[PDB]
Design a protein around this motif. Structure first.
Motif, PDB file in Angstrom:
ATOM      1  N   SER A 180     -11.402  28.698  51.437  1.00  0.00           N
ATOM      2  CA  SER A 180     -11.408  30.074  51.915  1.00  0.00           C
ATOM      3  C   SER A 180     -10.109  30.793  51.537  1.00  0.00           C
TER       4      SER A 180
ATOM      5  N   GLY B 177      -2.041  31.005  58.673  1.00  0.00           N
ATOM      6  CA  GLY B 177      -2.927  31.419  57.602  1.00  0.00           C
ATOM      7  C   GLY B 177      -3.930  32.413  58.156  1.00  0.00           C
ATOM      8  N   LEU B 178      -4.120  33.514  57.419  1.00  0.00           N
ATOM      9  CA  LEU B 178      -5.024  34.587  57.814  1.00  0.00           C
ATOM     10  C   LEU B 178      -5.896  34.950  56.623  1.00  0.00           C
TER      11      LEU B 178
ATOM     12  N   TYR C 115     -14.841  26.645  63.612  1.00  0.00           N
ATOM     13  CA  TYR C 115     -14.605  25.576  62.647  1.00  0.00           C
ATOM     14  C   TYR C 115     -14.125  24.306  63.333  1.00  0.00           C
TER      15      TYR C 115
ATOM     16  N   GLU D  58     -17.413  39.697  64.856  1.00  0.00           N
ATOM     17  CA  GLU D  58     -16.089  39.087  64.825  1.00  0.00           C
ATOM     18  C   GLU D  58     -15.399  39.375  66.159  1.00  0.00           C
TER      19      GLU D  58
ATOM     20  N   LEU E 297      -6.485  20.273  59.198  1.00  0.00           N
ATOM     21  CA  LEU E 297      -6.624  21.508  58.438  1.00  0.00           C
ATOM     22  C   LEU E 297      -6.105  22.627  59.338  1.00  0.00           C
TER      23      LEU E 297
ATOM     24  N   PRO F 135     -15.455  24.643  50.989  1.00  0.00           N
ATOM     25  CA  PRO F 135     -14.825  25.407  49.906  1.00  0.00           C
ATOM     26  C   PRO F 135     -13.585  26.148  50.396  1.00  0.00           C
TER      27      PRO F 135
ATOM     28  N   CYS G 222      -4.601  26.044  60.962  1.00  0.00           N
ATOM     29  CA  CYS G 222      -4.805  27.479  61.015  1.00  0.00           C
ATOM     30  C   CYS G 222      -3.474  28.193  61.173  1.00  0.00           C
TER      31      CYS G 222
ATOM     32  N   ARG H 132      -0.619  33.843  66.918  1.00  0.00           N
ATOM     33  CA  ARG H 132      -1.652  34.661  66.292  1.00  0.00           C
ATOM     34  C   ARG H 132      -2.888  34.697  67.169  1.00  0.00           C
TER      35      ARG H 132
ATOM     36  N   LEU I 253      -6.929  34.500  66.522  1.00  0.00           N
ATOM     37  CA  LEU I 253      -7.918  34.163  65.505  1.00  0.00           C
ATOM     38  C   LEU I 253      -9.212  34.869  65.857  1.00  0.00           C
TER      39      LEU I 253
ATOM     40  N   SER J 298      -4.644  25.423  48.844  1.00  0.00           N
ATOM     41  CA  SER J 298      -4.573  26.444  49.885  1.00  0.00           C
ATOM     42  C   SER J 298      -4.726  25.833  51.274  1.00  0.00           C
TER      43      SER J 298
ATOM     44  N   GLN K 264     -11.952  23.902  65.787  1.00  0.00           N
ATOM     45  CA  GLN K 264     -10.511  23.856  65.995  1.00  0.00           C
ATOM     46  C   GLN K 264     -10.151  23.163  67.301  1.00  0.00           C
TER      47      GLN K 264
END
Ligand SMILES: *CC(=O)CC[C@@H](C)[C@H]1CC[C@H]2[C@@H]3CC[C@@H]4C[C@H](O)CC[C@]4(C)[C@H]3CC[C@]12C
Ligand SMILES: *CC(=O)CC[C@@H](C)[C@H]1CC[C@H]2[C@@H]3CC[C@@H]4C[C@H](O)CC[C@]4(C)[C@H]3CC[C@]12C
Ligand SMILES: *CC(=O)CC[C@@H](C)[C@H]1CC[C@H]2[C@@H]3CC[C@@H]4C[C@H](O)CC[C@]4(C)[C@H]3CC[C@]12C
Ligand SMILES: *CC(=O)CC[C@@H](C)[C@H]1CC[C@H]2[C@@H]3CC[C@@H]4C[C@H](O)CC[C@]4(C)[C@H]3CC[C@]12C
Ligand code: NI
Lengths: 324, 329, 329, 324
Positions: D135, D76-77, D23, D269, D62, D133, D64, D15, D17, D97, D25
């Protein structure tokens, strides 16, 4: 505006006039012995008769589109920002822009004849009056052979193009309009075969997904692409009333509804009238934004040996047929 | 097919009917005392009168689109490949698809009333005869509040959606149609400001470059997006004839010319008729592919207390007004 | 097939070269005293040095794109079907298409200078050899002022256009390319304001719905529109490495992946290499389809007063950094 | 933001990102004996090992996107504006999640296994921490059979879809994404046959006019359509290095360059990293916005029986190869 030549059996020539304000247009027949006083050309006291849509100022027909009794037609469409006219010159035949339709239809019978006689021509910057500057125009010319040409005077001079799609709108220059059509070469009326994602079953959830990228905009390029498509795929081998019906539907495919084309604060360009002229028979069919019933004027029911303009109302009120 | 509710002053409900073949449609008034024999509901021998376009089979009006005397309108549009009808069940009010327009218009006055009364409804798989299979439909319901709803029966059951754009076409499911609209959020009827290439002077060579990406295809999504735009921007505060005039132009912005929409080998879907009904006044205005002159039938000029169907021709030949006839009357 | 001039602080000139056939391209420095034997012009045994991508045949550099030590750059791009070359004539300065980049870079320093000296020029139909016919090209010329020009020889002769967007692809003629850009004037990097359907809430379900109509095709117009947009909106005021990194990302947004541009039976046009040339410093950065690591050759670290071509490999194998090698050095 | 399963010979899962916030990563291998403390499932002290891109907080990975040692992969997207999570309920297998990738890769080997086992699942609203939280996500799951599924939790509950195009982006709901694909059924990589204007000679002035309407925008539908096309037509029957190179080119075709996707005032982005993960071999290839050289971490060169997370740097500086 959008102009087409349609050739199902007889030949039909006409256009949608899209603007925000009217210029007093009427149906006008100019008979054979109305005397044209051309600006920089000899006066012609005997010439072909014509019928079309015109403004009349000082007993002069300023045509927007017209056909003559020999089956030639010319339509003038806005070319603002692209066109250029040039000062009268001694080495050429100087035709003023406001009289180009009149002169061509007074004098010639075929597209080939117009092509031959335009080689020595300059479209001059002369205007009709101090009160009426010369608006920027280019022209579609068609005849009973089913072929048309585009006449454009721009920065690089006067140009005459063969028109393989028999349609014209506004800007850009005609070679660019032709090139842009190749961008739609994958459009089809039906369903394409899936060579997009081979091996995937795409759900063809609507009819006519082949037209999903057909332009629907009110701008000049969008209307040109869509009308070329509607004209090319329209029915053939029809008689008079069916041919006229389909001609109006082709032009309604690119009509401008009030509100969709905003040209100033709450000022809208909309399709004010639609004309459809039978080249073989000299009949002008028309309707307008406020009246969808088609009306017809036949040139050949008038005395074409006359010398006064013969005029009829164009814009009309909605003519509803009350059934019960 | 394309259906709209237009609210310039009075309110107008109607549709284009685009298809490759006619089904014997005519203008049909159903008076108050015609007796509806609904497939799985109590018969109604007294009900609201209605007017619209319908086929007539065995003295039964099978409506395409109609309005009633109270100002409610319903139109049925093809939903082939998306819809689903269900077997009759005891725990529900069962309305067959072919009779949905008649039942709603015979029984209710307002969109709110329809919305309240569809909570317990099953759109059944019953057909008009063993030999007339039930075509797959979804419906637009509008009224004089200027609001409308979309009624859709699919694989997950019956759904009723508020319709914020007052238009409907064919597939896909209605929430997808609404989502797709956001893809056209930059469209404007005039010229955009050049935030595309800041610092570069882009010559605006044509009027209305803001509509350059407006869809003009004959497919369902293309027509939905275009008619939403045309309807949203149409004039307001107009009197009767000018409102009717603008209404036909809205629907002509998505008309289908013969040759443009191919649905079988050299078989074409085209706009066969256009209807426009005034909800306040009960007047049906119409034209068809072969006759662009608008015709009108006024429901209130007939005997609405009778029990026989009242029918008028819909499809007509081209009605040309010859100006210089030289009859010298 | 896509060329740009990028001006964040320093000035960078370069191109994607997309094709299905390779021509033995290498990195080639032409030093100041290489003897150019032009076809119809006096030879120049002393001139500006230059660096770019070229084929080498019979000890002659045949450049696809290059810059010189004064900060002038020229790139040649396919113009097939649009271009025309003309026979050598006595009234004109005749330059052969295959030597246009060499001649301009050997002789001039600025875009203004090139524009002044092209007024009497004819791009001739002379070919490098019998086995090497003159492919049809047009050129982008840019320099450290951040301005560029387009040089096109077509059926109407030689034209020189100022280029307000600092980019070039293939057909059609450059004035048509520019005009087509106005069709995208409503595109924005963010979310448009909803003037499409005023009074309707359109859920902006995705970021950047303002680019929903931005072209992503492999064809010439699509790449031109998108690269103009990426170049216009790219970061400014940046150091060397960050500037070079952004330059490669601009051109990657219009890269041609194998399979997407089919030019024959199982034959594909794809992005063979990407060059990025710092005009102020004389450094060429490059990668290629098989190696995404960026390589760099500095002109000013060679003997610019020699007379032999200095050549380096352009195409390389994928140069992977293996991380968890456990060599425990 | 864009995830694919590519099946030329070996199977590659990965993928782009694309976002405006980082975050923390890193590349993270979770060995077989690291102990997962799941919120509402029994703890797993022995499980399959995995490698991927993850944030690390309180000694918890966590993820991605990641693959496990059996050849299963999950990405995860963002599903913002579409997704919904639900409170813990007694009738279901409740997966939080942020732990979905972890649990799935720890427990299962094949896509078919995942389908069979999601029928009882509820994606819960449990978050990792008060500062982290939950996402809104949806997931692509793929394996070495060359098949994939889409997992979406929305207002109507949990849905599992077979994915015929082996790609995923952001909103809208997946069935709407597949419907939208049919709107591009006329796209081809070469030249279309002119069935648009039969009888007219359209000059095909550029190569690949069949892709003139392919989307190039930064929005979710545009990247979905284009990557599905790029993936479908990518080469096959290629060796390891050739395959990895083609995989990166597919995702570069829908990369987000800084400045083209504005999400706030001067905030953009952009594609911060690209991961490519060989399912048969357990190798993670990667690069990032600042470094286009490809890096590789092989899961099997580590001791997979350990219990501590093994971490490497993801984000790097541009690694230029100076030639002279
Ligand atoms: C739709 C579009 O192209 C707009 C065209 C309108 C505004 C044009 C079409 C023909 C024009 C007439 C032609 C006759 C005279 C010529 C004079 O030079 C100016 C006045 C004139 C009546 C034109 C007015 C604009 C016009 C209707
Ligand atoms: C444009 C489009 O959506 C096509 C819709 C046409 C084909 C539909 C719409 C209304 C339909 C009528 C409705 C009444 C009956 C219902 C029966 O189940 C079948 C016959 C019937 C006359 C339908 C025929 C198709 C129809 C005109
Ligand atoms: C999409 C696109 O623009 C591809 C351009 C390719 C095919 C062009 C670009 C530069 C060309 C070189 C230029 C130097 C010589 C000139 C000779 O006339 C022919 C051989 C030559 C190496 C060209 C080959 C094609 C070329 C790489
Ligand atoms: C366009 C797009 O898909 C961008 C997705 C980014 C923002 C997502 C994808 C994976 C996400 C991680 C997953 C691990 C944890 C989960 C926690 O619930 C929240 C923090 C976390 C690091 C996520 C942040 C967003 C994320 C990178
Ligand atoms: Ni009479």
């Amino acid at each position: 505006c959008t102009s087409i030549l349609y050739s199902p059996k007889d030949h039909y020539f006409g256009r949608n006039l899209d603007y925000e304000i009217a210029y007093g247009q009427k149906v006008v027949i100019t008979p054979r012995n109305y005397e044209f006083k051309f600006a920089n050309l000899p006066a012609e006291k005997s010439h072909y008769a014509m019928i079309g849509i015109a403004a009349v100022a000082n007993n002069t027909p300023l045509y927007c589109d017209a056909i003559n009794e020999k089956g030639l037609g010319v339509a003038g469409l806005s070319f603002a920002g692209q066109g250029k006219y040039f000062p009268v010159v001694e080495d050429k035949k100087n035709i003023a822009s406001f009289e180009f339709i009149s002169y061509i239809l007074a004098t010639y019978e075929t597209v080939d004849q117009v092509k031959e006689n335009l080689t020595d021509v300059n479209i001059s910057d002369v205007s009709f009056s101090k009160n009426t500057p010369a608006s920027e125009l280019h022209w579609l010319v068609g005849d009973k052979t089913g072929k048309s040409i585009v006449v454009e005077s721009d920065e690089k001079g006067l140009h005459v193009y063969d028109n393989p799609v028999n349609a014209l709108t506004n800007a850009p220059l005609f070679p660019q309009q032709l090139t842009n059509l190749a961008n739609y070469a994958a459009v089809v009326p039906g369903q394409p075969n899936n060579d997009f994602l081979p091996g995937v079953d795409l759900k063809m959830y609507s009819r006519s997904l082949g037209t999903h990228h057909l332009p629907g905009g009110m701008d000049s390029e969008s209307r040109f692409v869509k009308v070329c498509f509607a004209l090319n795929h329209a029915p053939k081998d029809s008689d008079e009333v069916e041919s006229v019906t389909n001609f109006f539907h082709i032009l309604q495919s690119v009509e401008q509804v009030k509100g969709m084309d905003e040209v100033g604060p709450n000022i809208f360009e909309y399709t004010m009238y639609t004309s459809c002229m039978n080249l073989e028979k000299g009949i002008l069919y028309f309707n307008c934004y406020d009246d969808s019933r088609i009306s017809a004027v036949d040139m050949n029911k008038e005395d074409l040996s006359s010398s006064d303009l013969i005029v009829f109302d164009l814009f009309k009120k909605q003519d509803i047929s009350f059934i019960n």
